[PDB]
Structure 1
Amino acid sequence: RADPLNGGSSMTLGSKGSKLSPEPHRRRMPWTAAKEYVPGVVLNARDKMVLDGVQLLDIESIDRASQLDPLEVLRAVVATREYNISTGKNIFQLASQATYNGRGQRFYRKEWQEGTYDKYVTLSAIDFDRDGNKGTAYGYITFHGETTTRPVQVDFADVPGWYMDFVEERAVPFTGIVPPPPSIGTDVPVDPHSYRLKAYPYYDAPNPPEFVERLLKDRGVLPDTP
C-alpha cells in the first residue's frame, strides 16, 4: 500500500511479492511488520553429539553420591562450552570476553559482510540477565557508511551468528558514553582512500560466471553429459 513492488501490477498474484507492503497488512497484528529475519531453527539446534561420553550433572543435583571426578567435571565443562559455541557465537558470548563488555566494538553478522551487503553494529551497552548467552544488547547500526542517530535494541542478539574484532581504540569505560560512529557523508568529509562505497541505491552486481554456466546447463543451453 505505502510501498508496493513494481507499483501495483496485478498480472499474477506472485507479481505482487510475498508481502504486499513493509507495513503490517492488518492493523490488529503489528508483528507482521517486515523485518530481516534469521534461520533460528538451524542456528539454535546445538550439537548434542558433542555431549556424547561426557557425564554432565544438573544444577540442583548437589548430592555427595551424585557428583564426580574433578577430571570428569573439567572435561564436562569443556564439552558444555564446545556445545554452546557448536553453531556460532552469540553476542553475549563474544561480549563477556572483550574489555568493558565490548562497548564500542563493531559486531557484524556473517552475511552482513558478504556480497554487496555491508552492515555492522557498534555496541552502546549491555544487560546480562542471570543466564549469559541471553540478554539485551543496544547499539548503533551502520549500513554502508551511514549510521543511526540514536541507539537501538540489537535484534537477534541471542541467535549465534555473530563475529567481531577487538580494537583498543574503540574501547569505552563504563563511566563515559559510547559515541555514535560518524556517518561518512555528513560528519566526516567523504574520502575515497579511507572508505569506498561497495554499492549505492541504483547499483547491482555483475553476473558471476559459474552461476551463468550453471543456469545455462540447467535450462539446457550448454550441454551436460552423464
Structure 2
Amino acid sequence: RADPLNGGSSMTLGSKGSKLSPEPHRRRMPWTAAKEYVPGVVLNARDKMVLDGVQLLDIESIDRASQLDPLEVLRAVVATREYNISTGKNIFQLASQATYNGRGQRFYRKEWQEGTYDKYVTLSAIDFDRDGNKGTAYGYITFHGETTTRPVQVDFADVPGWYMDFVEERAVPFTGIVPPPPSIGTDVPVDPHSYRLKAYPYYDAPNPPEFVERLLKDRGVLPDTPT
C-alpha cells in the first residue's frame, strides 16, 4: 500500500500496525482515513457542577413569572461564561476577543508545543454561525517552519484546547488579505539565531532519566520495597 510500517513484515497482527495505511482501507468509506484526532469526549465534557452554584434561565422561558432578579441573571451569565471557559478555549472564543477576529494570529494547542512536536496555524479567515462558539475557520498550517501554500480548513476548531498570544503587528484588517508565513527553508534564508530546528526527519529525543527509572522499576530490575 502507501505506508507499509516496517515494510510488509507480518510477524504478528500488531506488526502491521493499528491502522494499515493512511488511505482508507475500504474504498467505500472515506472518513476512516488516518488523521490526527483529539479527545472529543473529554474536551466536550464541560464541568456540570460548576453551574450548580446559581440557577440558569432558559432562552425559551421568557414569561414574566419566571424572570429572576437582575443580580441573579448577571450571576447566571458569569456562571455560563466560566462554564464555557472551564474545559479550555477554542479559536471561536479567542477570535471575538482578538481584533479583526484574530486574523493573521498564531494558534497552537497545548500538545502542539510540548516535546519535539512544534506545529501552529496562521489564521486566515473565520466564519461565524448563529452560535458564537461554532462555525468554521481557515488558515495556513505550519509544521517545523514549513507552511502550506494554500489555506486549509482547520480541524477541531470547536474543542476547548486552543491557545493564542495576541500581537498587533501580525493583525490583518478586513481591507487586506492575510499573507502566508514565509518558509524557513525556502522563502527566508536559514539562520540559527532566528530559528533553530527542534526535530529533523531522523531525530528522536533521548530517553529521559525519570522515564528510564520508572520503566526499570516497573520491570523490577531496580530494588523496590513498600513503605
In the superposition, the TM-score normalised over structure 1's length comes to 0.99
CA distance in 2, matches of 1:88, 1:146: 28
Could you tell me the percent identity over the aligned residues?
100
Report deviation, 1:224. 1.0
TM-score, normalised to structure 2, is: 0.99
Q: What secondary structure is seen at the aligned counterpart in 1 of 2:108?
A: strand
Deviation of 1:53 after TM superposition, in Å, equals: 2.6
Query: What are the Cα deviations for residues 122-181 of structure 1, in whole angstroms up to 9, with x where unaligned?
Result: 000000111011110000000001100000000000111100000001000011100000
1:89-118 deviations in whole A, cap 9, x for unaligned? 011001110000000000001100000000
4+ aligned runs moved over 3 Å, structure 1: none
1:171 equivalent to 2:171? Answer yes
How far apart, CA to CA, are the structure 2 residues paired with 1:90 and 1:4? 35
User: Counterparts in 2 of 1:1-226, with a 5 A limit?
Assistant: 1-226=1-226
Distance 2:144 2:137 in 1: 21
Deviations 1:16-68 (A, max 9, x none): 10000000000000001100000000100000111113111111111111111
DSSP-derived class of the 1:31 partner: coil
SS at match of 1:41: helix
- Structure 1, residues 69-108: CA drift from partner, whole Å, max 9, x if none? 1100111000000100110001100111000000000000
Where do 5+ consecutive residues of structure 1 fail to align?
Answer: none
**Which segments of 5 or more consecutive residues in structure 2 lack a partner in the other structure?**
none
Match of 2:72, SS state, is: helix
